[PDB]
Write a protein that binds this DNA or RNA. Structure first.
Lengths: 57, 300, 113, 49, 207
DNA sequence: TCGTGCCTGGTGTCTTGGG
RNA sequence: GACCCGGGUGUUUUCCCCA
DNA sequence: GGAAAACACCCAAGACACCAGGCACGA
């Protein structure tokens, strides 16, 4: 989530974060709910866009 | 200083936002906060920011060295000589400044790295410094018989697994509770397992992956308080068997390690997790040793 | 054609084995699934190949070698064409003739039509 | 399971006469055994057999 | 070695919810999930299974007199601000008032002392990015009409110069797509531009 | 007859090739 | 707060329907 | 184009693991 890259053995990883749709929820700047796979565009900065892969915090 | 990449990428949520516009930060205070300087260096290496070291009294040193070097003549020839000397001195300063800046930067980097190394060493030592749980009416260092109960998640369809280990460190019996943990049947079966089979565990450990485990912990504590399940003491206020939460980084890593699979080829993953919890309670140091390489991935 | 159709390529020395998409299996009932005809024919061809290899290295009566190699030739030929006039067809255990690859492509119900 | 409804079946898995049925409803309930998986890990008897 | 270490309320909370006490405390905004709507309160669930509740004073704005059920329904997640945290019982109270969910922007406690912080640079960058936000794009208008011509004011006047008195040309207006400038030749080398305001427009290019 | 037990017959199981 | 699913043979043969 | 109805690797025989019963034998 920080933006860095790491290399670790498969054993060291804790576990997959299995999250239900009731847990993986995203809200945009305006407050409209955005779900998995939707396309959003960055409001500022590079103003890039893409499809959501996973939502966390 | 900020590059265009720094001008665009340093967001209010990014960890680099703490020094987006820092200025005139004292060097002597940096050693007390090594992580700030390390993060500044990391941001610099990303092509976002530029770290600059400057002296408020640089002009004072330049003027003093010029006064030492300059001639005292007043003729126009002496004026030309002094001008040539001063210009060469300024060029020498221009050449010299970057090397001194780099040397000071490397010195502060080494100091901050050593400070953070010692800090991490102390944190790890604090993490791994804990003797095994001492049951009452026993001397310190005695290995207690332990019982671990866990169900993992608590979704509809989550049975509670129980694993008991003696002081010898060898698994004695594993049991499944297939009824609901809130039913009277669950409590009755757990009481029968605790009492009838002469298991007599010295401490009971409870752990899980979410907040659903809290309800199990409360239910177990209520059951212990209700049935007066006092510890058996080898031959009189008999003491109750303690029920606590257990830290489970080593257990989580052990449930995925192939060492457990070789040790227990016909056991479920939750059984391995409970065994890891029990072994951690018996001896945290040996469990931390069992991590081998994965211990370096722990949040220290 | 030198690049595309060389005359010695008309003799089969290595056989391509099609993927299961070409020869899918069917679940006859809730428990037992049925192997396709091509799968059984390929199993027969591979058994004949194993038999030839085993016979060659151990001991070589020419009569036995001729018999086994002729069996292998028959299996490979019927795997691709089971309507060769002048000789009996390959039959399944149920008595029906084997549905060779050539039969898949011809007729109203074939691939093309 | 089929996408229809099983609520019209009796205790013995057979519908009773006099019951109105529609398309895709289940009129005969039958199950075949399957070797259980490793779900006995932590499933409270709620594992598909 | 020291005796066995027993986890406390903060450690148990961090172990169970995997959320630090710093990242979950007063004055934080989280996208909680509505689980039950009632007239006097709403029961919501956070991402980390922490059950929350809001008393009726905060689901709806103090000025509004609507019903909680009409505005918010089950499955409609909304932003909420943490007011209180029961770490032992994993219970929290939230507020939907915009004074928390919106005004809380600079939630970091970074010391902005001018001696060690360049406030002027951050402010200047702030108006730079705000002006960038103000920047937009515009395009031309296309209209289908026999007497409509995409010309400037001077271009329209020159086009009407070769024509006798009274001929009429139509061009887009500078006051917006909802306005139209009509240029007609009053006299030799004399032209009048008249602005026409459009109402009930079906489209920008439409009439 | 009481008691510890043997040791080979047998249940349950399975491989894997004949047809 | 207890929360609802998503799968279907193949090969022969026979008897029909409209031209 | 419709529907219905009957068939689709079976098997047997030699090799292994576990068990148990009824008879041996000392006392």
């Amino acid at each position: 989530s920080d933006g860095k890259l790491l290399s670790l053995p498969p054993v060291s990883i804790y576990s997959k974060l299995n999250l239900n749709p009731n847990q993986q929820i995203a809200i945009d700047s305006n407050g409209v709910e955005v779900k998995v796979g939707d396309t959003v565009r960055e409001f500022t900065g590079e103003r890039r866009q893409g499809t959501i892969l996973h939502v966390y915090r | 200083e900020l590059t265009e990449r720094g001008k665009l990428q340093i967001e209010p949520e990014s960890p680099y936002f703490d020094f987006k516009y820092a200025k005139n930060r004292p060097i002597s205070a940096l050693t007390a906060t090594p992580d700030l300087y390390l993060r500044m260096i990391q941001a610099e290496n990303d092509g976002l920011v530029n770290i600059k070291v400057e002296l408020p009294m640089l002009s004072t040193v330049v003027d003093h060295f010029y006064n030492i070097l300059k001639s005292d003549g007043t003729s126009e020839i002496s004026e030309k000589w002094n001008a040539l000397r001063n210009d060469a001195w300024k060029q020498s300063l221009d050449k010299l400044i970057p090397l001194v800046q780099l040397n000071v930067k490397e010195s502060i980097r080494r100091d901050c790295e050593r400070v953070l190394y010692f800090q991490v060493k102390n944190s790890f030592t604090k993490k791994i410094d804990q003797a095994p749980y001492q049951p009452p009416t026993y001397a310190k260092g005695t290995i207690p018989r332990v019982l671990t109960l866990s169900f993992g998640e608590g979704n509809r369809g989550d049975a509670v697994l129980g694993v008991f280990m003696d002081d010898s460190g060898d698994v004695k019996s594993q049991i499944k509770f297939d009824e609901d943990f809130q039913s009277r049947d669950f409590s009755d079966s757990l009481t029968r397992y605790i009492k009838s089979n002469n298991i007599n565990p010295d401490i009971i450990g409870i752990s899980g992956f979410n907040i659903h485990t809290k309800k199990l912990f409360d239910k177990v504590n209520e059951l212990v308080n209700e049935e007066r399940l006092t510890i058996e003491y080898d031959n009189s206020d008999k003491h109750l068997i303690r029920v606590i939460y257990v830290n489970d980084e080593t257990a989580r890593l052990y449930q995925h390690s192939s060492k457990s699979s070789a040790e227990y080829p016909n056991r479920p993953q939750l059984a391995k997790y409970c065994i890891g919890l029990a072994k951690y309670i018996q001896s945290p140091l040996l469990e931390y040793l069992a991590l081998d390489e994965s211990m370096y991935s722990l949040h220290i | 054609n030198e690049d595309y159709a060389r005359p010695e390529w008309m003799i089969i020395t290595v056989l391509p084995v099609p993927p299961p998409q070409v020869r899918p299996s069917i679940a006859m009932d809730e428990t037992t699934q049925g192997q396709d005809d091509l799968t059984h024919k390929l199993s027969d061809i591979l058994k004949a190949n194993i038999n030839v290899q085993k016979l060659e290295m151990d001991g070589s009566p020419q009569h036995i070698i001729n018999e086994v190699e002729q069996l292998l030739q028959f299996h490979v030929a019927t795997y691709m064409d089971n309507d060769i006039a002048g000789q009996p067809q390959a039959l399944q255990k149920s008595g029906r003739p084997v549905k060779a690859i050539r039969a898949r492509l011809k007729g109203k119900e074939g691939r093309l039509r | 399971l089929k996408h229809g409804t099983y609520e019209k079946l009796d205790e013995d898995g057979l519908i009773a006469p006099g019951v109105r049925v529609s398309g895709d409803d289940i009129i005969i309930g039958k199950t075949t055994p399957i070797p259980p998986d490793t779900e006995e890990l932590g499933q409270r008897t709620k594992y598909h057999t | 070695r020291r005796d066995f270490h027993i986890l406390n309320e903060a450690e148990i909370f961090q172990l169970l919810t995997r959320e630090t006490v710093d990242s979950f405390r007063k004055g934080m905004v989280i996208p909680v999930y509505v689980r039950k709507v009632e007239s006097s309160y709403m029961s919501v669930s956070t991402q980390s299974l922490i059950a929350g509740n809001i008393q009726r004073q905060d689901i709806l704005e103090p000025n509004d007199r609507r019903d909680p059920r009409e505005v918010y329904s089950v499955g409609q997640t909304v932003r909420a601000c943490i007011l209180d945290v029961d770490y032992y019982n994993f219970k929290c109270q939230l507020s939907l008032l915009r004074q928390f969910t919106e005004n809380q922007v600079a939630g970091l406690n970074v010391n902005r002392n001018p001696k060690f912080w360049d406030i002027e640079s951050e402010n200047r960058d702030r108006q730079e990015e705000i002006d960038k936000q103000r920047e937009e794009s515009r395009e031309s208008r296309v209209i289908k009409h026999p007497f409509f011509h995409n010309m400037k004011s001077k271009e329209a006047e020159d086009y009407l110069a070769a024509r006798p008195v009274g001929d009429v040309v139509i061009r887009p207006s500078s006051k917006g797509s909802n306005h139209i400038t009509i240029s007609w030749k009053v006299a030799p080398q004399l032209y009048q531009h008249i602005d026409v305001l459009e109402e009930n427009k079906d489209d920008a290019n439409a009439i």
